[PDB]
Write a protein that binds this DNA or RNA. Structure first.
Ligand SMILES: Nc1ncnc2c1ncn2[C@@H]1O[C@H](COP(=O)(O)OP(=O)(O)O)[C@@H](O)[C@H]1O
Length: 535
RNA sequence: AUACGUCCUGAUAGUUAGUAUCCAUCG
RNA sequence: CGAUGGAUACUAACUAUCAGGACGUAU
């Protein structure tokens, strides 16, 4: 029942020296050793939470992946595991419930932002956290919540060891030139205080996992000039699916084809058209079934129509695909990574990739033999797309060339973090509710929304911007806060002048937390009057 | 005829700010 | 409603270089 991997046991013993990051292609099995390293330190986690024990947290950005990884860890381990997501509405939960939750479970898999929230209000500090692994660590750039969490390491002492981990295949998240990749990798390895390694030998990975991705049958059309009325791209899909049927006459019923899109409306219309064609019972199209996977809760009541509700729908649709009930798939932005099917040999790239990372991630989804990669390109843009593809190939070649070990001898880069020009409130020191400079906006989201209050758009009570000349004539901004009649007086009516508008708002709104803490609205854990709504 | 210097539309490559549009993820 | 990331476009400044337009110096 247990399925090992030869290179990964070597990877584990190499990584169990210091902080180490593994970078490999899709299908490598890098995620699998997460459970092995979790069980390697299971003894520490056994500590009771009477005075604060050791617990392991697994951060996953996407909501459909938390249950999948929870089932994966449950399959090989007997430890109690729960699932956490803001869909349940945990915004109105007091300290005692959280203490009960921590004492009950053993591993709490949860998205990043909820971890931001819990660390923001001091329900528990970074102390006594046994281990912590990111998801898609290549997102840790600029003001990503990953970096916001990592910033809390600066406030605490270095002697503490809340080990951090994060796994990614592509180390970029935007378009770039082959002369800035070294700068990007150096910056990323400096930010998270960890080295990056990659398997030197890629035997099986090149056999069927990564280096033998589906062959790119670049097919063009004339779309730049219901199937026959909309752009002929749908006709190209029909022709390529007829080619698929001609290839797989033996499997004339169905296969595991997956369609990637970038706009939800396109996916919805595409699924509707193919379901209509299949239900018609015509000779050309009679055995096609597709279902939704993407869209997410979006918003409870604010200008949306998808209404994907709870994760139960995603769980059941993925189960019905795994059992073969669902065989065609359309989605936009949740099945790029973390979706695994043991037998898949066809991926249709209906919409073009936008950067390097998307192209690498959405290409290795197929894992079976003779897999098919299909790209929709136009004739006029064919030259530009060909040169862009050559650039991507060169980027991959140089990236695998620089796969040599890169250490971090200069720890000064970690100290070189661009600290904000103003300090935030912190009434109880480093051991108390350390308010972050980036959580002032979260606090101001819901002015007096707690307790009986209007349901109108009180979130944005409007602010006045004032500009004046200065010594360098770059101008300074006077952000002013004028809240309506809903609460007692406020100290930060206007903030300190700032070079930028955003920093002006931050300086004019951060002192609200400091003022409100003294007057008694908040508490020891900065939870306002322990009631629903508001952070 | 060459070289150098001041300002600028054009070009090569990077940074910063504002603005406008679009997309995705999540609370 | 909000925090974000990405993409394009405009203005605008600095940064290392090329060219041309307005002027000056050495040969
Ligand atoms: N030995 C194995 N046992 C079970 N599943 C596997 C194995 N090897 C690969 N897989 C499947 O293939 C996928 C590859 O996962 P892994 O190599 O851990 O990282 P990634 O998912 O990033 O490629 C997994 O989602 C898993 O379901």
């Amino acid at each position: 029942e247990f399925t090992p991997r030869p290179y990964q046991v070597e990877l584990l013993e190499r990584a169990m020296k210091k902080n180490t990051i593994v970078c490999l292609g899709t299908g490598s099995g890098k995620t699998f050793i997460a459970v092995m390293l979790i069980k390697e330190l299971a003894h520490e986690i056994r500590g009771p939470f009477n005075e604060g024990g050791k617990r392991t947290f697994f951060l996953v950005n996407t909501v459909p992946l938390v249950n999948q990884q929870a089932k994966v860890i449950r399959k090989h381990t007997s430890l109690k595991v729960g699932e956490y997501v803001g869909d349940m509405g945990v915004d109105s939960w007091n300290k005692e419930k959280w203490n009960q939750e921590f004492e009950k479970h053993q591993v709490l898999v949860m998205t990043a932002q909820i971890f931001l929230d819990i660390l923001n209000h001091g329900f528990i500090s970074l102390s006594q956290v046994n281990l912590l692994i990111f998801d898609e660590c290549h997102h840790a750039v600029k003001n990503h919540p990953y970096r916001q969490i990592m910033r809390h390491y600066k406030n605490l002492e270095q002697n503490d060891r809340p080990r951090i981990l994060g796994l990614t295949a592509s180390v970029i998240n935007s378009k770039c030139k082959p002369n800035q990749v070294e700068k990007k990798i150096k910056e990323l390895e400096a930010t998270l205080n960890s080295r990056v390694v990659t398997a030197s030998d890629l035997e099986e990975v090149a056999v069927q996992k990564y280096a033998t991705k589906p062959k790119e049958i670049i097919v063009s059309y004339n779309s730049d000039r219901s199937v026959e009325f909309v752009s002929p791209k749908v006709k190209k899909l029909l022709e390529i699916l007829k080619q698929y049927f001609s290839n797989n006459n033996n499997s004339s019923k169905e296969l595991c084809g997956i369609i990637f899109v970038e706009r939800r409306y396109t996916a919805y219309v595409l699924y509707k058209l193919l379901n209509e064609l299949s239900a018609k019972r015509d000779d050309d199209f009679s055995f096609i079934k597709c279902d939704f996977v993407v869209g997410h809760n979006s918003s409870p009541s604010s200008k949306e129509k998808s209404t994907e509700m709870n994760s139960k729908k995603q769980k059941e649709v993925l189960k019905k695909f795994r059992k073969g009930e669902c065989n065609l798939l359309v989605a936009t932005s949740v099945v790029e990574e973390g979706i695994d099917i043991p037998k898949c040999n066809l991926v249709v790239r209906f919409d073009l990739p936008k950067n390097f990372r998307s192209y690498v991630q959405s290409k290795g989804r197929a894992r079976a033999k003779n897999s098919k990669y299909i790209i929709m390109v136009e004739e006029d843009e064919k030259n530009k797309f060909q040169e862009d593809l050559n650039q991507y190939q060169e980027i991959e070649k140089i990236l695998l060339r620089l796969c040599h070990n890169r250490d971090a001898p200069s720890e000064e880069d970690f100290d070189s973090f661009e600290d904000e020009l103003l300090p935030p409130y912190m009434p109880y020191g480093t051991d108390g509710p350390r308010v972050t400079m980036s959580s002032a906006i979260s606090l101001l989201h819901r002015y007096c929304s707690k307790l009986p209050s209007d349901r109108f758009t009180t979130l944005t009570p409007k602010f006045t911007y004032i500009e004046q000349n200065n010594e360098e004539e770059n101008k300074m901004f006077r952000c002013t806060l004028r809240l309506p009649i809903n609460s007692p007086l406020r100290e930060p009516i206007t903030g300190q002048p700032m070079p930028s508008k955003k920093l002006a708002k931050r300086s004019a709104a951060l002192e609200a937390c400091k003022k409100l803490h003294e007057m008694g609205e908040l508490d020891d854990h900065l939870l306002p009057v322990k009631i629903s709504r508001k952070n």
